[model samples]
Target: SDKTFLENNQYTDEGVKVYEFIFGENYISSGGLEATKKILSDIELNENSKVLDIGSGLGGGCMYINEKYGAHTHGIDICSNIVNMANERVSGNNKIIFEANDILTKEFPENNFDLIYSRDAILHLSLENKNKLFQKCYKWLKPTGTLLITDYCATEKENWDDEFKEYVKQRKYTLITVEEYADILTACNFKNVVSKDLSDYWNQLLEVEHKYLHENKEEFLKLFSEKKFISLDDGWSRKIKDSKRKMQRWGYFKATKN
Candidate 1:
């Protein structure tokens, strides 16, 4: 059978904010304003500097950077629909460009970028070839330029359980620990490495989403699968409940070039 992890169709026309409200602030799926402010606020986005946002879902990060930093950016995504919608949202901006491209196999000019930022896209890469992804990021960025990423990470497995495993599957995750992630970055020689577990905040957001969905089922019914609405809605609820009870967490990583 196809036991591939499931990705919920929880997004709607409200765009990224809706997704975030349902999955972020209280979750890691947030990078638009709050999380973006974390790493993006520090980037020196001058007129001469170029930024690239890989997996530019809904272009929320692009929108924030262009509006606040005044830097030009090239945004790319694998989904044509996402790319198109991203372009539509910023139709008047010349400084920010959106295109549909499979960046995993694609190449960018060497040393041409000031920053290579990915919001939450790294999880898609299989663990078997994860280094290749970092190698490409290294190649695309200018020397010593920062490579900042916000990702989901697992805690030690001794405390992990079947329900938590199901929660990971629902989120389409690989369930790797922070220490293991550090090894990948070290192997890639990514300098200035930093990883943090913010599982508490994520679970809090998950709980809020459950409350909203439970109270406003009609409004959110179309946001999830017709068949899995009850499950996803309840799954998220239980996921948050378990996260709190277990004290496990999601994490963040920040690294730089040597």
Candidate 2:
């Protein structure tokens, strides 16, 4: 269901371009390149490192990792159209690769990666699938390998307002609380698990994006349409409100397979 919805609607060529317009070139998530740099700042990798980017949208994160660390970066995305665009974003870079495949069905040798990273992507998974995926990540990581992720989280479902509920239903997102997210990694046997609720930071980013969108309305309308611009504006407004109240959240997690 997630794959079908994403491939057919959310990550189609036009859809991706719309996202890149707001999120910045080669990015499809909040804060774009700036956020990527911040998330990776504390991480250390070398030319010999190998990285696996789950749900590597637009190939930006992989490209950044490869550039910053000289790592061999492999990315997997479920949407073929997204993967194709990601491939087009790079040329003559044998150090980075992207594949179109469901990560659950994809195989990798054990202890293979120095880092496993994802950004604002895993919320698309069902709870059961999230657990299964973390288990797979644990197996895929080398001893002392790291797992880093930032994702959309939310308050307990019981606290959800009708509008938030409808939004989640419409998007088919499966969100858990930040605490629950950390527990999943621990349950998957990841050591030194750390989780941070970054909702306030997310709120700031949304505000900045909202301001940019409004200020660039003419440019946006020229590239797309008034209707598209309005939709994005409205969506960001909701996120700003929801994230401020913690109804919607952003979570950051880091752990190690030791």
Candidate 3:
């Protein structure tokens, strides 16, 4: 939803690498792309079924699904430029559509979507407001439809040190624990709620980012705005610092409405 992970193109040069590092190249961390692909493949999807990728980033995941699985995929981004980039690259096949829009503001017709895919997003939702989004998702999904969520989150009682706590507070992010996320899903009448923690994988990812920075410090500096990059670096730096004594986690979730 927000460009908090990294600046627009900051990870283009190394997005997958970052993904692999964070989620594990070989293991499928719940929030890892590989894990997502596995989960998607396990589900029954076809060209006729519509997927609303709620927080499509640069449209990479949607494009990947369209190309690899032949699904009728639609994606939207709150950021204009990222949406434009997705529009430019997704062509020839009318099955795929991309737009610049915010999920919170847009309206979805009832029973329109077969599945709702939101990845590493949705932490932006305030506790009071999350129910509305879930209600909307329930309304949009056809009966028995799936809602797949792969998101960045911290477990309850992260036991954050003062520095990390300050960092999270400044970002205004509401990272929920696994049980809390499940409660939100259940509150909206979602069935079979499931979530898994992959804190170890996140540690690995931070390690990779640091190694990359160590090797290409000059190049990364030249390519990104210093402020954004600095903040992005802080995310990983925080992870690196925490791994010594604490843990940071990213996770995956799945639910269905009956």
Residue 6, model 1, lDDT = 16
Q: Candidate 1's error at 27, in angstroms?
A: 12
Ranking by lDDT: 2, 3, 1
Question: Global lDDT of each model?
Answer: 0.66, 0.93, 0.67
TM-score of each: 0.78, 0.98, 0.78
Q: Rate residue 211 of model 3 by lDDT.
A: 70
RMSD, one per candidate, in order: 4.3, 0.8, 5.0
Model 1 misplaced stretches (Cα beyond 4 Å): 1-28, 157-159, 170-172, 207-218, 221-232, 245-248
The per-candidate count of clashes, in order, stands at 2, 0, 3
Question: Which window of 10 residues has the lowest lDDT sum in candidate 3?
Answer: 21-30
After TM-score superposition, the amount by which residue 68's alpha carbon in candidate 3 deviates from its true location, in angstroms, is 2.0
lDDT of 3 at 140: 91
Residue lDDT tens for model 1, 1-258: 011221123233343334544544322254335656765666677766688887777777877777777778888776665566667677777889888777777778888778777776766666764678888888788886877776656667677789777666655556667678777887888888887666676676566567766776675666655455565566677657665764345666777777
- TM-score for candidate 2, please give it: 0.98
Candidate 2, 17-132: lDDT as tens digits: 88898888899988999899999999999999999999999999999999999999999999989999999999999999999999999999999999999999999999999999
